[PDB]
RNA sequence: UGCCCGGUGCCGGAAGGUCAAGGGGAGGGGUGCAAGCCCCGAACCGAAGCCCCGGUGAACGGCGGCCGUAACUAUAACGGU
């Protein structure tokens, strides 16, 4: 039971698939669950970040409240 | 038909260590008035065997443990001791 759940999150997809991608051309730190595109990767690929979670945290209460 | 000759066996080894009878007789003892007679007795010389030095497995025989490490977990080619 601990390895049919740990190879569904890592995903074997570590090419390039789930969940974010770091712009350090740019800086576009983006999360491509939702959308939402920042420069923030000064404030956060180098410090913390619990503000920039809370969109995938609101976004995700939407989608499970309201259907 | 692999690896191990440290132990055992067998094989080789005029060195060395130990080694019995025998040789040797520094020195001591018994007795006799005595010449003498008799008895212990160190050094040193003195084999095989053993020690020792090597060889030998289709001679007797013996051919490990612990710990970590790789693209999910597992495993561990790799390392450490
Ligand atoms: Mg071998
Ligand atoms: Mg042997
Ligand atoms: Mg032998
Ligand atoms: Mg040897
Ligand atoms: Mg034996
Ligand atoms: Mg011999
Ligand atoms: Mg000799
Ligand atoms: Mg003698
Ligand atoms: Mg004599
Ligand atoms: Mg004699
Ligand atoms: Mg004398
Ligand atoms: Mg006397
Ligand atoms: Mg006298
Ligand atoms: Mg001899
Ligand atoms: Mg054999
Ligand atoms: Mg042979
Ligand atoms: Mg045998
Ligand atoms: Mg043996
Ligand atoms: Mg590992």
Same mark, same amino acid.
């Given at each position: 039971?601990?390895?049919? #759940?740990?190879?569904? @999150?890592?995903?074997?997809?570590?090419?390039?698939?789930?969940?974010?991608?770091?712009?350090?051309? %740019?800086?576009?730190?983006?999360?491509?669950?939702?959308?939402? #595109?920042?420069?923030? @990767?000064?404030?956060?690929?180098?410090?913390?970040?619990?503000?920039?979670?809370?969109?995938?945290? %609101?976004?995700?209460?939407?989608?499970?409240?309201?259907?």
């Amino acid at each position: 039971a601990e390895a049919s #759940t740990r190879r569904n @999150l890592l995903g074997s997809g570590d090419r390039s698939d789930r969940n974010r991608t770091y712009n350090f051309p %740019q800086g576009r730190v983006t999360d491509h669950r939702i959308n939402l #595109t920042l420069y923030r @990767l000064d404030e956060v690929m180098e410090g913390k970040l619990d503000m920039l979670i809370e969109p995938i945290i %609101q976004e995700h209460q939407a989608d499970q409240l309201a259907a």
